[PDB]
Amino acid sequence: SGFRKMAFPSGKVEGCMVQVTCGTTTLNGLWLDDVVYCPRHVICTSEDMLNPNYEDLLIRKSNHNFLVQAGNVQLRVIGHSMQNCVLKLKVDTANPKTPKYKFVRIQPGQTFSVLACYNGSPSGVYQCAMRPNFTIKGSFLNGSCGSVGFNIDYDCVSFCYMHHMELPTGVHAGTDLEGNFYGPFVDRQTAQAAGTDTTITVNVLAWLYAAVINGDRWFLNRFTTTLNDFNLVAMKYNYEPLTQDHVDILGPLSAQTGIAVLDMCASLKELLQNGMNGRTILGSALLEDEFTPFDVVRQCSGVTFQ
Amino acid sequence: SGFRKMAFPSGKVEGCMVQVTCGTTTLNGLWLDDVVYCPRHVICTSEDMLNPNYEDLLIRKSNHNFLVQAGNVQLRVIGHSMQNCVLKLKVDTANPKTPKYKFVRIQPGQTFSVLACYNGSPSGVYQCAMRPNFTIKGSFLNGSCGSVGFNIDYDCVSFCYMHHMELPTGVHAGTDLEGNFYGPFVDRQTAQAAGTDTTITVNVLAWLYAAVINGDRWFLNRFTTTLNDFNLVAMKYNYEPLTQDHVDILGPLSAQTGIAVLDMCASLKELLQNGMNGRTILGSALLEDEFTPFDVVRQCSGVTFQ
């Protein structure tokens, strides 16, 4: 028993982390086979960043301008191109530790692990969600750019995120591994603000199922609701609409606990309208929306990876 | 910016995890050089566990009775002994992935990462604290026994915990790597209860320093207090006494923020007596006591490991 915010084991991603230096700028790179992926603003100095011409700045650079280190060892760059907001540096050595991997673009509401890195060396690992407003609530300092976020499915690392920037309010923005931003953000030092966020309703329900499984059951009421009446209440409290797909995805947790999704919706409606009255659920005083239904089943079923 | 509950990168510990089977019972082992460390109750069946004679049960076992798998590969056991609550199985192959490591016995209040494992395969990683009552608030299912907890100091893995058991209220108990229990617990299925817990005062202060560093400053008052007057208030709210050692350990965060430890004590006293009035600190509605001063400086300074 017990429920913790749990990250994927980081070992397969640790073996892929390198340092990329171009001039004054060092950040992190991801070394898969014979390619290093990093943020394209490694080619910028301090003044450049207000409004850089990347395509232009990159012409003034030769392969030899990029210093790539995998721990001690220097990797020799033998090619380089820009894809959207990411650099691909071809190196003369394939990474012998390259895991089986995929590049995925995750959906808002989905979770992943971040391996926070400085100078190509891993700092820590923590679980995040892609917020509805396409930001993450991370912990990133200057030097963390190029750190990646990922899921592991048995032996396969699905890379979904590369860190580029911080926004007002201490939230973070980045790209998929094809260098396309999540949300409307751009890799320029301009006035950019995150959209208003919303609470990921399906994840809050998944977490109430995690509470029941763990014997924290005080908030279960005797009532049901319709999907329509539920979404009218959710709307007031800045919660995303619950869809039928969301209901279907909650099916297995519903069946394991013997609590219909619409009955759990009736309990969430009461919590939203009445508050928690100083009580906790799974040790928390606020409703948690950063656990997917999959995360709940995995953690409560003890699913493992290669 | 941003503050997350962050685990150590798990890669060095992942390479040490194996499966140990004795009869019907499979749990996890830690393979360092040519020795596998696991919980000694791997030699028990279901009925044994009410009050096992370990010394006795272990005599009926030969080396060949222990099936040890490192992924696919079987390891051949060529020796076995019991040290307190742990088995040492000598194997004919030294682990080529053995990191530089130490066995440490941590102090209550100190944090570590758990690599949750099933059938020798890693599940997830999360940060825990050794509670004052010698329990941890973990996430452990049947099959997780032998999972280890650890700190990384640059290249060196300090093993401090091996998982043995769950207690009433969904909290967990285990041993150091010399097989001695943290707290008064025993590896028998008896009525055992955790002592009353207390809040780790020094860690709450470290976390308020983390809030200020991150620009969450609303709870800072204009007052100071003496150490004695502070500890009289702490006592009422079931907080540990703050010692001079604790004050000295908070010195660097005090200096970085320009807030004397006794001034921050005055602010915590007001929070304890008045509550948070529906406000949050670093996104939390409750005071957090599972971040050490070291954890705060590391996460806010971007310290990395080999």
Ligand SMILES: *[C@](O)(C(N)=O)[C@H](C[C@@H]1CCNC1=O)NC(=O)[C@@H]1[C@@H]2[C@H](CN1C(=O)CNc1c(F)cc(F)cc1F)C2(C)C
């Ligand atoms: C990254 O380049 C690195 N070397 O680590 C760095 C990471 C951030 C520093 C602080 N925390 C981070 O995650 N990224 C950047 O410096 C990016 C790059 C230029 C500006 N920028 C920002 O993050 C700007 N941040 C910012 C705010 F957070 C808030 C605000 F009001 C204005 C800001 F500029 C690029 C986007 C090219």
Ligand SMILES: *[C@](O)(C(N)=O)[C@H](C[C@@H]1CCNC1=O)NC(=O)[C@@H]1[C@@H]2[C@H](CN1C(=O)CNc1c(F)cc(F)cc1F)C2(C)C
């Ligand atoms: C471990 O042996 C394994 N194979 O994973 C297992 C781990 C626990 C199962 C549930 N969560 C765990 O962390 N340990 C045990 O089964 C230990 C071993 C015998 C009993 N036991 C318990 O954990 C008993 N738990 C228990 C309570 F949690 C609460 C309660 F009121 C009574 C209990 F027995 C040993 C201690 C030898």
Ligand SMILES: [Ca+2]
């Ligand atoms: Ca050269």
Ligand SMILES: [Ca+2]
């Ligand atoms: Ca044999």
Ligand SMILES: [Cl-]
């Ligand atoms: Cl909370």
